[model samples]
Target: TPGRNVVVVGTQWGDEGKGKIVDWLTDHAQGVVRFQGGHNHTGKKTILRLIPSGIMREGVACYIGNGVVLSPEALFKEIGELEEAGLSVRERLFISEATTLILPYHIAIDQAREARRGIGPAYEDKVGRRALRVQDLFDARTFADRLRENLDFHNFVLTQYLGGAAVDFQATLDTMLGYADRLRPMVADVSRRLYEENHAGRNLLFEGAQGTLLDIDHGTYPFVTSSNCVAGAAAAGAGVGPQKLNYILGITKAYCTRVGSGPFPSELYDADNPSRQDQIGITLANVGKEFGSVTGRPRRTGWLDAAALRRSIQINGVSGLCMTKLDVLDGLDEVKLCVGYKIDGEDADLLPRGAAEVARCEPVYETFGGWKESTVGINSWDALPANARAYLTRVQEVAGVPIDMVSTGPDRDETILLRHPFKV
Candidate 1:
């Protein structure tokens, strides 16, 4: 009989500390597969620099499935870094050939789109807002040519209407071609291997990039990732049946952090205000802490939102939860959880769908006493403070799911398990 196990995914924005939690679960995980998203996904942890969570574990196999949008340069760089760290990545790592390449055009298009969205551009500013990034422009040559026409039009608008300099089209093409050449070899047909493994009853862990709340279809509009980040995407991306998945583990931070411009109801902008609880929370978590894993942009921080989490649970069919970044909230005397949302004076326990509704929505908070004790060097759940336990329990109650693991720190050993090890 094939033993089913957990499929770990982010429930919020990227950087929910999934690498550490996934590494912790690899002790019982026979295989780890990345189902969706691209190398654009970034989780906060030092170990991913050395080795993928599963590769660090002895005998555990890691597969980059067909659904993933891979950056050949990034993949090779990560593998090389791991080798330098004394970890062997060549034997245990497998790449699915069917995986789409995130070519240089994608990066160029992404940056070009962002540049064209500048303030006071034109009446077409709204159109520019809807302009797709490089990641979204990946398609056949015809489609690429059409996108080039659009880019050329935008460049014309910038030069004539907006009185700005012209964009260099040839330079962009050269850069994209260079990236495509480098990425060609890493592409593979992964669906066949995944199907074969399923028939053999091998344990598979489908890892998702980004979070459910950042999903293009279900997330906050105009503020989400370009790709699908939901659990249902696993089957399509990994070339497997829905029944193949044994469990879905949703990963979240102890608090919350979001990057870029979006509708953040609980965002703390003022650091010196003593009366602002959200500001205090921000300061405690090092909120002004801005470091983009890829672009190095500073991230925005806020309180944990349960309403958003419930939506994630529903979309992902989350079987278990892995709460991470508990150490960031250590000094706070009280922690506030967003239990619901208030839209146009009406209270609700679910996230609003559209941008307007989300922008106007207010967070309804529930306060819990903080533990004020450090979880450093602690490996057992029983050793957690009563307040911390209560906090975790409250999260489960509000989100309507059980939390199976808690990450105390970034290292592999900083995880506390809520269940016994599974035997494959």
Candidate 2:
């Protein structure tokens, strides 16, 4: 009765085309679980976040595990949109009661400082052990008391230091209390349910929101995301045993694209640097549509860095690689693959730890002939161009993992599968 689980993680910076792969893999999955991160902008015939990519599949159950930080508003908004799209969201989705709540005050502070979502501060409070969880909303008195105290601390900083207006405590309290009723039906003991599901031989797929490089402990320091996003995190986040993660599918774009600030060694264009306009980078950005779905920020595009991917495979203990957006490189005259790096004029084959060292490294490129043939919607291994196959095979060799799947387009049939994660 033991069920198999496959954890999907982004090998590069966030947005390594994970959603498409996760959705693709959901074919064999009975349940899709999100292990970490509160925000996302996934593209798979539609945009998604806070909800699992499994939403498109009718019978699939989507679980927001305890590892996630809950934003009730975001959850309802996404559910509304999914419902509008004729999906039964509330029926299929379950939220762990222990999940941390992202409140109005957190958003207030986050917006006042920079105007992004409150995920960072929410995780901050969670680590501090003072954050309100989804369970707190059920107890009226406890919720009010904790909300008041937390608001006091946040409002003081907001008014005095951040030069922002204070969030009304009662307003915040009332809004959250109202959400409890809406959430009550969906709240569940996700860990226990997962165990039961597995005992029934139902396979689960843990969808990691951010990429390996954004992991707090293992990724580049000071430049990484707030939480641990590696494949191992699925165990802690989903309240499952490490051994339950039977296979790890590392998703990487054919070329790299990073949304926000970070060290990208193989970068073809620096989004912040206005003076440098590399046409290749422009083509990668434009053709790949490398823009942030949520923030609308243009991502920094770069050559495929196999050295960095080697690090990801090692860190993630990746079973196989799913190379996405191969079609994005279709029309280029020639393509460059970053085989390694040069730091202080010395050779390095593996990406160095931390942002500073990675920032200083220069890419050592090996050029390959680009395919003029459209790779879009091609489903067979033999159907792919020889040049594209050469590039992917080299990437597999460099990263020391088999390229089990290649995503050529947004359609489900566009994928070329070498080895299925659930099967293998």
Candidate 3:
């Protein structure tokens, strides 16, 4: 019987130390897969998205699932970048041919209406069903036929409809198809391999990008990422059955952070920012090198919101929580955590959905003491300072999930593993 495999995702708005955590956990996982999000064209693979998180682990197989919008030229560069970093990518990697190729014109069409359709096949036209995926690139007849048809349609919309210009069909076809050879050898039957690994008694880890609150459909509306970034999407994206996903590890920051904002109750300030919080947020940001790594923007930072964390737990069915950047909170004179919220002039346990509802929030905070001693490089729970443990203890109490792992620093060794993912 196929058993428990872990899925790791961000609890807060992403960039919550997923890569280090995923790399740490991959030692037990035989394969790693990236499901969705990267809705933004950003560098730095957090939780090692698009590419396998197990690049450092030679034995593990890695895959880019169908849900990702892969541009061969861009993928070329991404794989190139990883290769340059001394991470062995090409040989161990397997890419899904079902991935939607990002076309050139697609990049230019960022109009409000088009943005709603998203980069993937979200438009009424695409789901209406004639969109060509990666498999077409190999079939010469299908490739040209679909390429011409798509170009003609897109060109009509661009030149005649959107008042833009027509793209050369031959140029577009040639440019995209040119990647066939490079992509072909790496192409894989991902869904088949996932189950095979299962039958082989091997565990796989599904790494999700973007946080739960940034998830499309379930997350805050008109402010979320283009694709469904929740844990459940992993099965659909990777073509694995739900039963195979036995465990979920939600990666949360020691503190909170956000990008192009929507209801971050933990945003620092008794006055300067949107939420109610403090000097500790500033230190956490600088200390952890916290930023909107995906959006490439400065993210708001503040105390950990157990209420928000609980909301994500409900949505993701997260089995455990892996807390990261704990060292960022180290050496602070004081520490603060948002246990709940005072929203609509009432105390609420979980952070509500939607931008409008969250903006109205005035955080009801539960303040805990701090650790003057540096919590950096501590891998064991016993190594944590008394007050530090007290703060984390309060977090686990309010959030209703075990802090399964705590990342003490950026290094792979800087982690405290309580309950192993495969075991759980």
Score residue 279 of candidate 2 by CA lDDT. 85
Q: Candidate 3 at 200: error in angstroms?
A: 1.2
Give the best candidate by TM-score: 2
Q: Per-candidate TM vs. native?
A: 0.78, 0.95, 0.88
lDDT string, candidate 3, 103-133, tens digits: 7656555452353413643322235466667
Q: Each candidate: RMSD to true structure?
A: 6.0, 2.1, 3.7
- The C-alpha stretches of model 3 lying farther than 4 A from their native spots are 1-3, 38-49, 82-88, 111-130, 156-166, 269-280, 292-297
Cα RMSD for predicted model 3: 3.7
Clashing pairs in 1: 97-187, 97-188, 97-189, 98-188, 98-189, 110-134, 290-298, 292-296
Separate clash counts for every candidate: 8, 0, 0
Runs in model 2 with CA error above 4 Å?
A: 41-46
The TM-score measured for candidate 3 stands at: 0.88
Model 2 TM-score is 0.95
Q: In what order do the candidates fall by lDDT, top score first?
A: 2, 3, 1
